[PDB]
Design a protein around this ligand. Sequence first.
Ligand code: DE5
Length: 165
Amino acid sequence: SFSGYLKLTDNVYIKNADIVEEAKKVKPTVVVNAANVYLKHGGGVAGALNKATNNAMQVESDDYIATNGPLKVGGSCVLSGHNLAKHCLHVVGPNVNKGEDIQLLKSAYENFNQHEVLLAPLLSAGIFGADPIHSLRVCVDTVRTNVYLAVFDKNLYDKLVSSFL
Ligand SMILES: NCC(=O)Nc1nccs1
């Protein structure tokens, strides 16, 4: 199972790790993708997860969008986890760099509550522009299921742990 995680709360765990390498080692039931409404996995966590699937995640995502249309900001969809997980939960956190409502971050984390255990990144962090310290706070105050957070950046991981209330 998951190893080397620091326990933050009853159900939230954190590790300085690349989520792609973490998914390949663990092969969790659910890996969370930091998705956009179009499921266009170009950069950040999405680009890295998609590249690990040899673009199979993007091909599957384009078929999903052709059938269903775009997701809502704060929404999610369950697709295949390919070689990374049983399932991928594509969750859309607000992109602050696109002027999206930061209050949607709580709605985005609520999607995690439909899964008993997940491997996930901090929503809206990185190229999505939100404060990762705020994202971790919303995560621990919203998610009740078991979430294993992978933070790629060592310096950010240290800052998150040392500032955790
Ligand atoms: N290029 C790899 C990468 O970005 N991995 C990440 N793991 C967690 C968040 S970002």
